[PDB]
Point group: C6
Chain length 166, copies 6
């Protein structure tokens, strides 16, 4: 039961990397060119887009994917250059911490949906203005799916922690 | 008779992978930039495009392609790390289920054609408006072809299910 | 005399694949953005382009190239997994049939030239309107060249069929 | 003296292929989007561009590069599958003929310069109109350089023909 | 304690290279097309963009990444071609110097944030004008993160310098 | 002292290759689309851009990079096919000549800076007009850096010439 957990963990991790590398690069491609606000102000479009989407989903996901894979490279470099079980335990702890932190950060940054309308009141805009997002449903689907995958990985890492940890 | 079926399953699967990777990436390239509605409303174009095409065909097809290939990687990782016939049976069942689910989902999401006109009545649009789709015939051809290929794969997997299953 | 024919068949097949992969991807790149109609109607451009070019030449050619190479992969998978001469004969028959069918289909779909003007009378256009095609001469040259190459391949396959067949 | 000719021929051939693959793909990138005519006629821009540049330089050069390398693949396939000196002589004759034909065709199609102005009188344009070409000097430089390289290759092939031929 | 420092130095270096190669290429993609100024002057947009962003962040970072890796290639070429400890010491000194210089240069060129507004008074603009930057928050995040990573690398190199140096 | 010179020559050459291949391809990407002139004349933009930038910097640099590496391939092909020291001496002389010629040509074509304004008086423009260049500072930095690198390579080649030559 604990044996299959590693196979499912590696498969989900590679699955996530593949999804992000192959499909995510192109849903967000036109994020800002298709974002439009009802206004005649130069620079209101830029300001309101920046306020609505401070960091794009795909940037956060690439960063998270790369950062949650760093203990593996550290352990590999340590072993190739040269306790070792001590390294295994610490890298497992670190991966668990990183994945819980990244999941919580995703929840706090983005929530669970991307709405189609946005109300912005930042300079140079005059009082509050209404702006319109491109492809909200697809981005919501991607958000929910990525949350599910990250939850799966967190669950597996907690499983292994409780299996080895005392 | 059942022997050649595996070779034809492998060939159809690789054929589908190639078709999606080489051709699908560029029929849908201009899906939203060429989508136009008869209106003077900012944000009506975005809303009506999102309502007409919630998830693009090529996104669904890439996701399906990746998801219907996961039992193979699971089995491979299980064998490389280390009954085995039990794994073969379960992964066959899982592939069958996944392909039937994906085919039914395709039918329920997209139907059998992509019309050239679309009637949309979502905010910020004023009552119902008419919008025009880009490349409807090519997308219809792609839809029908992919449905045919997925049906072929489902048929083959059911064949093997009934051959081994009791 | 029949020996060199196989070498020339292999060379023409690889030649065709190379031509399509390297050059064809970029003549058709701006097919719809440069297509223009003399009208003030929203959506007439989309409708008339779709009626003039239901499936782009390069899509048909990529599909044909991939489909005329499937017997080779089938035979290879059959041999790697494990009469064999029976497989050779059947795959030769199948390749011949596929190439004659694809050549006839090309002739029936596209003809021998791409005109510079197109007259369209599809909704939402008001009566018949005139539209203008981009790069007609280059596309005509490509059409004629591809027809010639496909004819060469058909001729070679019929030659070998009559050499082996009785 | 005849020994070094082979080394210089292979080096010039690879040099030409590299130049075309790395740099030529991007001088011609904006050929039609930057082409402009002094007129208010829809479709005059397309017609006059097609009349001024029936086949783009880079398309002809890629086709020529691929076609002048076909005897090498034919000879290689003939040798891998299995007089041989007879094949060497014939492929040398064929390469010579192909390169002289391609050089003459280049001269007859394009000349020695690309002018900055073009005068066009094709339908739908009203009488003669003036159009303006993008990047004429760079294209002239490329034309002259490619003519020089092709001349070098022709000279080398004639040298070797006269060395072996009687 | 000094042993593990090398593993983290190599891992941080590869981490930084990966981040720059995979994600940085596309935040800055639309830097100038989305930059807009409140004016009716031709050429004011170009002048004010050039004054606000003389060298793009990603250009500086790629240059720095490549330049801080030159001692490694020099040492490798020296060893493959053929004291050696003398080379190790000098290349360590050189890497330390290069990374401190690059960090200070980053601080002096860019600071710690990218503001959303810019005030420009360069010809051809009439007196001072206001311009608006695209994606300021993401660029600020990237700036701060890269500063942190470069600081980490500087710290590690100083650590090892003081470990070996006397 | 003369031993390390070869290592530094190979490292600087590879460094230059990398800089041109990775970063230079994208500073010049929008060279003509962002070039603008203060005028209402069709075709004045094209003419004045062509007069200001006859050959783009990156085209010259790629050509130079490829041309200064041809003696190496010639020598390699000569050795693989089969005095040899005579070849070494001649190829060194040829590389020296090529690099001095290319450096002088760069100086005569481009100078040491790219100005932000350009004054053009070519047909179809009416008398002299003012045009505005995109990204002048970055292009000036690139110019100066490439001049420095090419000077370094020239210096090294002259060093080796005088070391071996008499």
């Amino acid at each position: 039961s604990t044996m299959i957990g590693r196979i499912l963990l590696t498969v989900v991790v590679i699955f996530r990397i593949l999804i992000v590398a192959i499909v995510g690069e192109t849903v967000y491609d036109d994020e800002q060119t298709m974002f439009v606000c009802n206004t005649l102000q130069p620079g209101c479009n830029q300001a309101c887009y920046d306020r609505a989407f401070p960091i794009s989903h795909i940037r956060y996901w690439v960063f998270q994917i790369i950062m949650v894979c760093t203990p593996s490279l550290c352990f590999i470099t340590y072993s190739v250059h040269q306790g070792i079980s001590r390294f295994y335990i610490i890298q497992v702890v670190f991966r668990n911490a990183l994945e819980i932190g990244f999941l919580v950060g995703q929840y706090f940054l983005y929530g669970f949906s991307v709405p189609g309308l946005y109300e912005c009141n930042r300079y140079p805009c005059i009082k509050e203005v209404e702006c319109y997002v491109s492809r909200p449903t697809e981005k919501t689907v991607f958000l929910v799916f990525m949350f599910a995958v990250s939850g799966i990985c967190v669950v597996l890492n907690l499983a292994e922690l409780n299996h080895l940890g005392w």
